[PDB]
Structure 1
Amino acid sequence: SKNVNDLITSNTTLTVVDAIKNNKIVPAQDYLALKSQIKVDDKVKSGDYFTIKYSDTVQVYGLNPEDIKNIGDIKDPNNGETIATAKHDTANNLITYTFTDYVDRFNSVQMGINYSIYMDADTIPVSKNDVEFNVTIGNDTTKTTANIQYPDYVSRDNNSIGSAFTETVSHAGNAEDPGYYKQTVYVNPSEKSLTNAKLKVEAYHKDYPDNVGQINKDVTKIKIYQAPKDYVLNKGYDVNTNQLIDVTEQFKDKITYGANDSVNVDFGSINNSYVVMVDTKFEYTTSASPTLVQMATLTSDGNRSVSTGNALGFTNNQSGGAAQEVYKIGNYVWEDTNKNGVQDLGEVGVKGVTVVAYDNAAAAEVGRTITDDKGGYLIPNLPNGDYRVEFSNLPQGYEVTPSKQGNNEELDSNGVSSVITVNGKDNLSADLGIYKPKYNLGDYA
């Protein structure tokens, strides 16, 4: 219920990554690596939240807005538990993290983040040195800067053009909805006077026979905007359409679909620049290395034609999909001071206990480990199935607490040997509670 930004501290780095290694920083190709270790005050409790905010020059997804899912819940790599659940509000350049009861059940809470974030060209219309990018974790801001250098538009004689994909959502291997993509074309950014100007956009290139792009009247939608004289177009293709005039309806009879995945827009005589947004559906593919290529060409009287285009590769994540799915079990050996067989707030883990997992039906040992400082353990890479977890090497003088108390199998003790079931998720309920009886030395009289 409370903002605890003031109760977290962090050690953070933000570094631009020249992904293509071409010694130029460009929002469409490059990104930012955010890394942080966050410490949370013990006063923090379940339902409290902290924020991560980021400057106007930063966004948390690139071409695929669905990629926002890559920045999610913060989890403990040592015991599998979720520490805080994440919720995005990109309109407010905000990520909010709400703590789970993890922070009630453990002290000395720490979290790590390792994110790839992106440059937002919205406020970077032109090439500019020392553009600042920053991120604010709780109340602590981290900054870095880069020199942004965009490519020139392409021109031949008085013809000029530029283009970029602005959005791509590929669902390769899916036949019913293969996904969609958008390309924006700048026509006549030089603002020359042209006559009989025509734009041709085509998902065709002789060097890329295997091409998932697709342009036809069935699947393609086109919007056209006119920019006023001297208007400075955004070089990152991040277009503020509210500032332009939507003239799509004046082109209704000027748009012609043609052969081999082409569409033609007849501009006639122009002297303004125009922004053409082409939205279309991917073709279905079984390729595993899908390639998209889409070219744009402007012709006009008395000038040589000029062509540009964009290509992108995709990674067919379905085909193969890393040998099915595996999950982890395990998670907690605690000192059950209560002796109630129930994990209570205030009780803590026991280090150095050996844990072994065997496949109940199959055969035997599928994993083994030892509890850490916090009593936590994990056994990774388990398929669905029934497992016998066995605890051993209890510390001298310790006794096993009553098994399966209460009606909550997540908060009880399993006993040194039990069977748990993995099915589509981690099973972290294989826990053991132990206690130390007072020393009972020698005889009594």
Structure 2
Amino acid sequence: AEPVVNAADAKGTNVNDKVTASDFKLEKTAFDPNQSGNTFMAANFKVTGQVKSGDYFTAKLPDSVTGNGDVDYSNSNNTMPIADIKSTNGDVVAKATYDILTKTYTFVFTDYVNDKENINGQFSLPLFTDRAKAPKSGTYDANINIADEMFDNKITYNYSSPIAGIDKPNGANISSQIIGVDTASGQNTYKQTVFVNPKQRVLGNTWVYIKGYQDKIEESSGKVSATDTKLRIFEVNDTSKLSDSYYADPNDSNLKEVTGEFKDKISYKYDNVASINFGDINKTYVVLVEGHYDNTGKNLKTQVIQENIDPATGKDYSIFGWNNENVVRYGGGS
């Protein structure tokens, strides 16, 4: 019924003891995740002695990073296929997979390895922030491990500040980030975080539009509707505790869900756009969007917008918009 386990894979025997990594290098130590910024890690590796088909070795990510970034594999067993290690002749030497939960790569050997000895090679992998564990702009410990060898590192995330808007006390202010996109399962879903009035200004007759396209509706795979979209809305207690990474957890104590108070305040009157009547609001809110994209293949392009006037004077009308873009593209399914 219950047995002890040490890993998340099926195969022969782990051979970290036979694999030594070397010349470990990050393409860079600083980038803006909020601008589709990322890095790659790359290393040489060698097998001392012999291994066989089904033996494997591993690499582990720290809290600061993910192997998958904004690509979601919930609908694929939280498992993200990786490109294979191939030989000059073209033959696959190892099959690669990344467990999202465990932030662990696994490389399994193919029958290639049987009749050979003292394999050497190198590989690179993309690396992205962990929006959840690296929520704020700053410098994190990024010590990566390979074949049981720790390669100490440090990454700096300069997240474009999600606190953006019209520079005036009455100013319209808003922003968003799509931090989650399922491109494998075929369900075509995404997660977008929207920060409303992150200046925590007092704004009247405030309207917010979440568009599933930007300029030209034809140019986006975005599908915003009653049927395609689910919205959750939270008042923010202390806007100071909002993440630069747009990661927001519904169960956060800093959030107070209010989506209920919005029952008849959300409209889909317009094609591919969700209109939200906030009205007079004097604080910051988070909208968690769970959305869908179409099979067109077009980039998922989005745009969030907020407008308002002075609640006391009804003058000083202000409008502010924020754009979002992601690649949903995939190859062949059947």
- Tell me the TM-score normalised to structure 2 length: 0.77
Separation in 1 of the partners of 2:43 and 2:318? 50
Q: Give the alignment of 1:290-309 within 5 angstroms.
A: 290-302=298-310, 304-309=317-322
2:106 is the alignment partner of 1:96: yes
Contact 2:212/2:224 (8 A) holds in 1: yes
Who is 2:242 aligned against?
Answer: 233
Structure 1 residue 207, shift from structure 2 partner: 5.8
Take 1:232 and 1:100, find their aligned partners in 2: how far apart are those partners?
Answer: 48
Which residue of 2 is the match for residue 106 of structure 1? 116
Partner of 2:82: 71
1:252 aligned residue: 263
Alpha-carbon distance, 1:98 to partner: 3.5
Q: Which residue of 2 aligns with 1:139?
A: 148
Q: Is the 8 A contact 1:229 1:272 kept in 2?
A: no
Measured in 1, the distance between the counterparts of 2:90 and 2:299 equals 40
Q: Tell whether the 8 Å contact from 2:266 to 2:277 is kept in structure 1 after alignment.
A: yes
What's the CA shift for 1:17? 4.9
Counterpart of 1:418?
Answer: none
Please tell me whether the aligned partners of residues 84 and 92 of structure 2 are also in contact (alpha carbons under 8 angstroms).
no
Task: Provide the rounded CA distance (Å) in 1 between the counterparts of 2:92 and 2:204.
Answer: 65
Instruction: Give the 5 Å matches for 1:2-401.
Output: 2-17=13-28, 25-28=31-34, 29-42=36-49, 44-65=51-72, 69=80, 71-78=82-89, 80-82=91-93, 84-128=94-138, 130-152=139-161, 153-156=163-166, 157-158=169-170, 159-169=172-182, 179-206=188-215, 210-243=219-252, 244-285=255-296, 290-302=298-310, 304-312=317-325, 314=327
Q: CA offsets per residue over residues 118-149 of structure 1, 9 Å max, x none?
A: 22222322222x43433211122224434432
Sort the Cα spacing of 1:187 and 1:33 in 2 relative to 1 into closer, same or farther, 3 A. same
Give 5+ residue unaligned stretches, structure 2.
Answer: 1-11, 311-315
Helix, strand or coil at the partner of 1:249: helix
Q: Which amino acid aligns with 1:26?
A: D
Which string of whole-angstrom CA distances, capped at 9 and with x for unpartnered residues, describes residues 39-82 of structure 1?
Answer: 12226455443210011121112333359745244343436143
Task: Work out the CA distance in 2 between the residues paired with 1:234 and 1:208.
Answer: 30
How far 1:170 sits from its partner (Å)?
5.6
Q: Percent identity?
A: 27
3-state DSSP class of the match of 2:251? helix
CA contact (8 A) 1:58 1:134 kept: no
Q: Which has the higher contact order (CA 8 A, sep 6+)?
A: 2
Question: Is the CA contact 1:154–1:307 (under 8 Å) kept in the aligned structure 2?
Answer: no
Q: Secondary structure of the equivalent of 1:154?
A: coil
Please tell me the residue identity of whatever aligns with 1:42.
Answer: G
Q: Could you tell me which amino acid in structure 2 is paired with residue 50 of structure 1?
A: F
1:256: how far off?
Answer: 1.3
For 2:82, the aligned partner's letter is I
Structure with larger Rg:
1
Cα distance per residue 1:391-437 (max 9 Å; x no partner): xxxxxxxxxxxxxxxxxxxxxxxxxxxxxxxxxxxxxxxxxxxxxxx
* Distance in 2 separating the partners of 1:72 and 1:245: 42
Unaligned 5+ segments in structure 1 are: 19-23, 172-176, 322-445
Q: 1:315 to 1:257 in 2, by over 3 A?
A: closer
Matched position secondary structure for 1:200: strand
**3-state SS of paired residue (1:258):** coil
SS at match of 1:192: coil
Contact 2:81 2:97 in 1 (8 A): no
Work out the CA distance in 2 between the residues paired with 1:26 and 1:226: 27
- 1:221-252 CA distances to partner (integer Å, 9 max, x unpaired)? 21223322344111111223321333333322
Q: Distance in 1 between matches of 2:133 and 2:147?
A: 24
- 1:349-389 C-alpha deviation (Å, 9 max, x unpaired): xxxxxxxxxxxxxxxxxxxxxxxxxxxxxxxxxxxxxxxxx
Alpha-carbon spacing, 1:106–1:283, altered in 2? closer, same or farther (3 Å): closer
Measure how far apart 1:163 and its partner are.
0.8
Give deviations 1:329-349, integer Å, cap 9, x for gaps: xxxxxxxxxxxxxxxxxxxxx
Contact 1:64–1:167 at 8 Å: present in 2 too?
A: yes
**2:90, 2:157 → 1: CA distance?**
42
Deviation of 1:291 (Å): 4.1
Q: Equivalents in 1 of 2:213, 2:97: separation in Å? A: 40
Alpha carbons of structure 1 residues 72 and 209: separation in structure 2 relative to 1, 3 Å: closer
Tell whether the 8 Å contact from 1:12 to 1:142 is kept in structure 2 after alignment. Answer: no
SS in structure 1 at match of 2:245? coil
Contact in 1 for aligned 2:225/2:274 (Cα 8 Å): yes
